[PDB]
Symmetry: D3
Subunit: 253 residues, 6 copies
């Protein structure tokens, strides 16, 4: 297994003892994803990508963070939806910080933080900064971290044309995530429940408290009507290949 | 599904709209469990118990907390072992607090926290208190929480005897109890042949910090799991599930 | 008098809020390196200048600006390893925003526009807003409304982008110390800009991931993400008018008389 | 002069730590209801009295005790719904322990014994210790050693338990306001105990789980978890001597001359 | 019965609060060096003794005192570089005060007097009170009233000042370990004061600013900011009676029956 | 040529710091009501102006000032119940000071002067400094020195106090919005003062204790603690020159090459 949770402490210790072991931590969220998909999507996708990348490059995968930062209207629909269960920023930051501190204690020095929930980004960044500050105080400056959101690896316009024949800041519960889920966890997707509505549009600013009227009723920012397993397989291949390459580049054996 | 994570928000909303929906939250840890078992035991076990209880009483299971408080020498071997990845007290407390705040926002009012890592106890308690305090400021005083550890529902002497025929002796970390449950639920994550059959750990009537590695058995286990078995696990599982299910029925009546 | 709250007596401020529909604006910036050709308080100066003009135009008031913001990130500000850049931890910035909102609510104010001038501040401003609103709710206050925006998000008209980047536009994710900010500075504070010191290097490019601790080798030596060689006061005057007009219209829409 | 740090001048304290092997002791208690027969500062008084006696025998010093502890839990202290009980949040107690350790390290001390008199304090004391030791490590200090204990754990001799509970032993789980604590008070502070007010009732029994908010109906009315009817000064003297010599010997072994 | 809450059973405490007009008092001190002639717990001992006497006269109750206070400052307490002085971080003291007020409110109490014996604690006590009152407001409680004071401020009668300082009065600024505190200690705790050890040095003088890290050379070697050579039991008794009667009347005025 | 860090490029700042012996100055103020005759940013404006002039004479640099300070207290600033006054929680202010010192240390700076213009900020600035210095030590830095002061403390010469208060001096305790600040504003920012609006009331007097929640009836209606009727540009010019050379000389003494 590539999952740290499924290893004995002796197996884990042996792996870290190699001195060049790469650890990966999926960071997601429990968030509404429309009428057609489950709420753990942001955990499932990065965990699936991590699993495959780890198998491909020989890394290990830490237990994923199941709860993330508050859902924002323009990226996740808004934190007023039922089901969505969010943490305060300080809580998420402290979790990332504590884990890095512990990995450093083990002797590990390479970590990939794979985000699957857009809103988590800056809180993961602060967690990394605070942890690295402490490590320096402990006399450790050789701990290296690579942070990324798996979905940022699908930029190639060529690939985009394939996913959107008819032609990113509106891909919550849409074609992208739904396609990936159809390729990975089809049993957790019910396409017949998709509400085919027009893409959500927003002015160049944000309003608080969140106004429910500004988010499409289903909670999705765009329709997943044209999602497919074929598209998900393409997305999966692009992400896994790209991320695996980045890791080989940043953490060579 | 009984797992909230596998439900769409409408399926979840529909259940809570009932008025007496019961939610369960597994709280575990990533901690060394000897040479014979994997490190996610404290998460796997409470989750498996929650799932079965949920199926029998019609409750829902929230995503489990994967990381818990620092492993203590006398209960989990110590936080000096590799693999064990622990949170500071404030972090765990804050996570529990945030989750309760959100569930209340959803309209839920019944929560069962099932702890699988001994050391988590008081931080789960503080998280609950701080959340309940805030709920009161929001005008909510009808949110009820039940906190329990599955390993506390096994008291029947007849059962204890079957589990420990050689005599019942706090030393269970990585021993017969957890190993048997794992053999029944996740046999592929256990290799009894790697078990180190050392005598139960004994400690002085106090604690020392920084933790002294010499005071913890080398394998990390506090007792031997040599006599662990699938059969014992099946017994423990059914006993805990039935006891917990009945307890929930009593505290959260339809 | 002035639209700056700091320049009003408490009686003047009280009278304004007593109107019941008074709009308050808070600029949020940073002290951060901006290359060899510009000063380091740009992120405070620009949103403050925009707030000033918008407030005067629509009849709002401007609160003292936050001079220090969140840690500079490599891909958006060059990185927090640079000398001069003086950053706050996330909790500190969040808490400052949270405290200000709590106090404005105490005064009786119920309308606030947060104008961000430093990209990295965004989510911490958001958390500060959320935590404050949560507290207001506990206090029995649910009519406080906040609008948060980055003045640079109001320049979209392709006709404008064309004039600003006749040679072509390569995204805004590289506008740190580039044509946009430098042009605004040339139009507002020309004395704090010296174009002859601009290093005309090609636009910085990055992979779709971040590395920590920050690697100095991945940021252009000058600290800028793109060259401001083609910056001008004319472009700045265009940017300024489009931003002021756009933000003023947005506030009129969200905070009607 | 005195074994209590608070009763020493800074010069006397300085001289004692300058020896290089000084052992410091910190009593950690609480202000909590202890039934109708005893006062509410028991959790502070007892560990302080035990520390004093141990200190006189080993040549240690006793720091001012922490008067406020963590929230009383139903199954161990009756519950935090009782009047009088005045509890701190976990972070507050943790921070207090952490701050004191940091200061003692500053003084040059490197040996500390924390004697907890309030069960609920345990994990927060442990966290305070860990956070302090982490900080000390960052400061280049790794020779600070801490021992944490409770006098309860030093009463294990069968011959002793039999003398204390001639009618059977049920464990320390239901001792709150019972025989053990009341007997010690009768021996040390007889004037703060009115045994004639003890409300006799069977030992508290609870299901294998906890409920929040705390349900007052699940705690015996008087607030005690067991009856102190059979408590006595004689039992208190026995417990005291047994705990003092046991703790004194534990300290000698962990902090050798 | 006793005026100390810690010495009451919860039943006795509940009855007193049930009256509806019960006043509670909380002494706040510190463990701090007090020269070569006095013990280090002076800041907690004095306010506790004054609270006790005030309470016996007005029928109030006294809570366990806070033994640890904020960091000693050079110009008020000598500096936090001295051995023995054991100080808390500001957040810790603030949180302790906040937690206690929250709990007293839960009890049903609505009147609190905080008597500070350590100058440096003042602002953290103030913040603790504000945060607690903010929370009470969120809980729907706005009738909790707090009075904060120090016995020092009740000694202003020229006639009394002359008797205490017949050679001249320079103010409270240099009183740390001086005539005022030492005289009170001589009248209340003679066993904890060894006047023969006093170092008769002139009043400490400092420049119009502070330096950090603290410079030990700027504090008189003994730790005192003025000489207690002229201190006496007689002056102590005078100070005590004046303070007790002044504080007692202040409380009657602020918390009318 | 400017002494303001915000108006320098990172290269110019880097050279000044790398040159060694660079003294940085940080103004810390507040947004607080200052009567009917003055604006609310006085506590920020004055220390910034003093710092600028001192910096120009000794070759120091001035950091962007902190615009928001700690809650106004009744006896020093009138109270935090006034509209306009916008205050931070203590932890927020301390964290801001702490983050700034950490960053300056990262830059390589080791000399900082904090000039406080809002009395209530003092202890939180102190805690910010201590927490920052603690961290620097963990980073292996023990040569960072901080000076904290207030221009108020540099006006002591009786000859000066004479010309300022020819009718008698009572102390700084009642100066909020009075002669001192108003005179400085008249000399530096006349357009932000309208002496005709001054309410000539007698100096505020308070009982020897504080009450919370704050009682509005105990603060003079205008918000001022004393009358600024006798304020003048001439007095302001005198105060300014006295403070500038006094502070300049103090810095030269504490920070020699
Ligand atoms: Mn998401
Ligand atoms: Mn465990
Ligand atoms: Mn910026
Ligand atoms: Mn207790
Ligand atoms: Mn003191
Ligand atoms: Mn002020
Ligand atoms: Zn998603
Ligand atoms: Zn386990
Ligand atoms: Zn900028
Ligand atoms: Zn007790
Ligand atoms: Zn004192
Ligand atoms: Zn002022």
């Amino acid at each position: 297994s590539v999952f740290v949770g499924e290893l004995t402490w002796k197996e884990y210790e042996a792996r870290v003892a190699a001195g060049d072991c790469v650890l990966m931590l999926p960071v997601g969220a429990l968030e509404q994803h429309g009428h057609h998909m489950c709420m753990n999507v942001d955990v499932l996708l990065p965990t699936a990508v991590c699993k495959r990348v780890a198998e491909r490059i020989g890394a290990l995968v830490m237990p994923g963070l199941q709860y993330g930062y508050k859902s924002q209207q323009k990226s996740g629909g808004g934190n007023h939806f039922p089901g969505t269960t969010s943490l305060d920023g300080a809580t998420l930051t402290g979790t990332v910080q504590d884990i890095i501190r512990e990995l450093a204690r083990h002797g590990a020095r390479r970590l990939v933080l794979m985000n699957g929930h857009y809103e988590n980004s800056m809180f993961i960044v602060e967690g990394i900064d605070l942890a690295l500050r402490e490590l320096r105080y402990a006399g450790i400056q050789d701990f290296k971290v690579v942070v990324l959101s798996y979905f940022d690896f699908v930029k190639d316009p060529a690939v985009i044309q394939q996913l959107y024949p008819e032609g990113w800041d509106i891909e919550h519960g849409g074609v992208f995530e739904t396609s990936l889920m159809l390729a990975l966890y089809p049993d957790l997707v019910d396409l017949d429940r998709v509400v085919d509505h027009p893409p959500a549009t927003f002015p160049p600013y944000d309003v608080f408290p969140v106004d429910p009227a500004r988010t499409p009723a289903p909670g999705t920012l765009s329709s997943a009507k044209t999602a497919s397993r074929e598209k998900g397989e393409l997305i999966l291949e692009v992400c896994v290949q790209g991320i695996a390459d980045a890791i080989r580049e940043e953490f060579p054996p």
